[PDB]
C-alpha cells in the first residue's frame, strides 16, 4: 500500500473522496474526474503526445469526429443507446395500447438508438477518403485524434485516448509498426524515473494480424496503457464498399490500397502510471516537461506591498514565455519554509524562487530545487532564460 | 455558397453539400470538421484560453465528465444512457409483461444517466473542493472547453468554451459588466468587420440579468455566446444545509459567492469567422492567429531534391517555432503558379514563400501575400524573424 492518492487528494491532482476514487475506479475511468493539477498534467501529456507524432513530421493531420455514433446499429453492441429524455416521457401518455404498442416501441429503441464512441478509429477511417486527398493521393499519412472515449465496466467510463490511424501501403506496413511500437514506447520512457517499468509486448488476431501493448508496472503489476495494431486493408474496405480505386492512394508508380496501422494510447492511465513513477519527505519528481506547474515564488524578509511588486513582474515575466507561475506570494504568514517546501514537493513543483529584500538591494533572488534541493543564490534577471533553459533541457536529453 | 463550397474543398467543413447545410452546421447536427477546420476551431480554442486563463491565477482548469449517473430529477429534455442489458430481459424475453411495463420507461428517467447539456453544472462540482485552492478567496474562476450534447429526435454535439466566476455579491455587478467588455472585445480583435459582432443586455433566470453576443451572419444575427449572473441561487440549490462550507472570503468579509456563468459557442465562433472572412478574388482573410495555416512553401525554378532539402530547413525552423507551415515542396505536376496562388488565398495562407535556385546560390527567397497581394525581396534568414514579429503585432493589437 502507498500513500500517493493521499497526497495526490490534497494537492488537487486527483478529484473525489476516499471512497469514490477507489483503485478499480481510477483505472475504469470511473472516477469522480481529475483536479486542476490533473488537468494540466494531462494537459501538457496531451501536448507532449501531440508534438511527437502530429507536430514532427507534419504528414499527420488533426481530424474531427463526433463522441456518437448515430443511426441503427447492428444487432446487439451491449452498448448503450441514446434515448432522447423527452421521447420517455411523451410515451408515459398516450395510453396508445397501454400494453401493446409500448411493447413494440422498445424495440425500435434498441435498433435506432444511437451509441457513444468505443474509439477514435472509426471517426479516423470516416475521414480517409476525404483526406486521402489533402495530400494529392501519397502514402502514408495519418490522421491523429485525442479525445475521451467511453468504455463500460452497470456503469459508465470516460477516457481519454490518444489515436494515431497511420495509412501505410502493405510493404512497408508491417514495417512501419515496428517504427511505431519503438516511437511510442521510447516516447513514455523519455518522461520515466524508472523507464524500466514501460514495457513491451507481441500479440495478434483482433481484427487483423500483428500487434503490441506497452504496459506500465503499477506497484501492484503490469497493467496496459497503450496498444498498436495493424489492421491490413480489412475495415477500409468494408467501411468504403464499392469503387477500391476510390481508396488507395500511392507507393510508388503503382497505385494500392493502403494498410490500417492503428496507435492508440490512454492518457488518463498514463497520467496515473506517472504519479506513481514519481512517488514511492514526500515529494513527487513529476518530470520537468511533464509537470503541472514549473516554479512557485513567494515573498520573504522585508516590506510587503513593495516586494509583491517584482512577483508580478515575474509571474508575468514567466508567463509572457510558456512558464508555468504559481504565485503562492498571495498567502499569508511565511507558513515556515518547511512547510512551504515540502508541501510545493507534493505538488510537484520544479523550482521556488523566493524574492526578499535583499533582492532590492541588488538585483538577486533564491531558488531551490526540487531534485538537488540546493538552496541557490540567483541574479533575477537571467532567472527567465535559465528556466527557458532548464525545462527544454530535461527535454533533449 | 461560395464560401461553403471552398470551406469543402479547402478542407474546413466535412460532408456532401447537402448534410453540411446551414441547418446542420447552426443546429450543430453536420457530419464534422476538416483538418482545416479543427485547426481553426483549435487555435479559437487556443487563443480563447490565453484571453482568459493563462493569466490572472484565479482561474484553473476544471475536469467535466460528460455524462452524470446516479438519481436524476425524472422530466425535462436531455438525454438519457439507457442500458441494454436492462432494456433486453424485457423484449426477447416476454418477462411476464401484460401487466408491467410502465414501471421501466417510470424507473428509467430517475435510474439513467445523462449526456451533459452544459459545462456549468460540473463546474460548481468543484467550487467546494477547489475552494481549499485559495484560502476561501473570491473572486476566483473554474475555467473549462468542452462538448454538450443538445437535442435537435436527433442528437447535436457543440464545443463549448466556459468561464464560472465566484465573487462576492457586493461586486457580483461589477464583474458581470467586466466580462462581457472583455469577451466582446475579443471576438472582435480577430474580426475584419467587428460591427457584425454585437452585444445587448436582458434578465429573469435562475438569477437575473446578463448580456447575450451574436455574430451578423449574412442572413441574420445569431446567438454565439452568454454571460449571466445567476447569483447565489444555483450554488445554494447544489448544497441545501451546509452552507458554512460555502463562505468565500471578501476582505475580512465570509458571504456566499455569485455565480457568473460565461458560455461561447466555439463552433459557431468558427464559422462566424470564415465568412467574416470571406465577403476569382476569393480568398479567405482570416485573422493571422486563427488561420490554421500561417505559411505555405514550394519549390520553383531550379533543381529538385536539392531545391526541396532547404525548404525542409525553413519548415523545421519555423514549426520548432510554431509557424504553422504549408508543406507544398512535396508537388507533383506545377499545374501554375496562379492556380497555386489563389488556391493557398482559399486555404487563408498568411504568406507563400519561393525557395528557388536564385536564392540557392547566394541567399534570397521570394515570399508572396494575402492581403497587400505584395512580392518584395527576403533573405530565406529573415522570414521567421519576419513571421514572429507579424503575429506578435497583428495579436496584440
Redesign the interface.
Known amino acids: 500500500s502507498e500513500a500517493l492518492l493521499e497526497i495526490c487528494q490534497r494537492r488537487?491532482f486527483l478529484?473525489g473522496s476516499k471512497q469514490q476514487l477507489s483503485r478499480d475506479s481510477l483505472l475504469s475511468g470511473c472516477h469522480?474526474?481529475?483536479?486542476?493539477l490533473?488537468?494540466?498534467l494531462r494537459?501538457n501529456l496531451a501536448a507532449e503526445w501531440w508534438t511527437s507524432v502530429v507536430?514532427?513530421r507534419?504528414?499527420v493531420?488533426?481530424?474531427?469526429?463526433?463522441?456518437?455514433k448515430?443511426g441503427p446499429l447492428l444487432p446487439g453492441?451491449?452498448?448503450?443507446?441514446?434515448?432522447?429524455?423527452?421521447?420517455?416521457?411523451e410515451?408515459?401518455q398516450d395510453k396508445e395500447l397501454?400494453?401493446e404498442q409500448?411493447?413494440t416501441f422498445?424495440?425500435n429503441?434498441?435498433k435506432t438508438?444511437?451509441k457513444?464512441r468505443e474509439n477514435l478509429l472509426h471517426?479516423a477511417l470516416?475521414?480517409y477518403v476525404?483526406?486521402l486527398?489533402?495530400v494529392?493521393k501519397?502514402l502514408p499519412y495519418g490522421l491523429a485524434q485525442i479525445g475521451?472515449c467511453?468504455h463500460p465496466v452497470?456503469?459508465?467510463g470516460?477516457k481519454t485516448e490518444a489515436s494515431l490511424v497511420w495509412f501505410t501501403p502493405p510493404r512497408t506496413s508491417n514495417q512501419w509498426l515496428d517504427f511505431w511500437l519503438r516511437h511510442r514506447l521510447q516516447w513514455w520512457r523519455k518522461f520515466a524515473m524508472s523507464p524500466s517499468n514501460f514495457s513491451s509486448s507481441d500479440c495478434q488476431d483482433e481484427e487483423g494480424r500483428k500487434g503490441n501493448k506497452l504496459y506500465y508496472n503499477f506497484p501492484w503489476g503490469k497493467e496496459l496503457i497503450e496498444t498498436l495494431w495493424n489492421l491490413g486493408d480489412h475495415e477500409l474496405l468494408h467501411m468504403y464498399p464499392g469503387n477500391v480505386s476510390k481508396l488507395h492512394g500511392r507507393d510508388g508508380r503503382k497505385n494500392v490500397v493502403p494498410c490500417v496501422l492503428s496507435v492508440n494510447g490512454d492518457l488518463d492511465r498514463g497520467m496515473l502510471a506517472y504519479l506513481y513513477d514519481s512517488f514511492q519527505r514526500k515529494v513527487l519528481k513529476l518530470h520537468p516537461c511533464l509537470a503541472p506547474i514549473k516554479v512557485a515564488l513567494d515573498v520573504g524578509r522585508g516590506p510587503t506591498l513593495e516586494l509583491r511588486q517584482v512577483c508580478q513582474g515575474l509571474?508575468?515575466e514567466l508567463?509572457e514565455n510558456g512558464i508555468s507561475?504559481?504565485?503562492g506570494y498571495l498567502?499569508?504568514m511565511q507558513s515556515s519554509l518547511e512547510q512551504l517546501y515540502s508541501k510545493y514537493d507534493e505538488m510537484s513543483i520544479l523550482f521556488t524562487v523566493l524574492v526578499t529584500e535583499t533582492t532590492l538591494e541588488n538585483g538577486l533572488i533564491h531558488l531551490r530545487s526540487r531534485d538537488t534541493t540546493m538552496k541557490e543564490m540567483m541574479h533575477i534577471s537571467k532567472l527567465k532564460d535559465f528556466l527557458i533553459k532548464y525545462i527544454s533541457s530535461a527535454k533533449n536529453v
Open positions: 488537487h478529484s469522480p474526474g481529475f483536479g486542476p490533473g488537468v494540466e494537459k507536430v514532427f507534419e504528414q493531420f488533426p481530424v474531427d469526429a463526433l463522441h456518437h448515430p453492441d451491449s452498448a448503450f443507446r441514446l434515448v432522447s429524455a423527452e421521447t420517455l416521457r410515451i408515459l397501454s400494453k409500448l411493447v422498445l424495440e429503441v434498441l438508438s444511437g457513444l471517426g470516416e475521414h476525404n483526406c486527398d489533402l494529392n501519397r475521451v467511453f452497470k456503469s459508465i470516460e509571474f508575468n508567463l507561475v504559481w504565485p498567502e499569508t
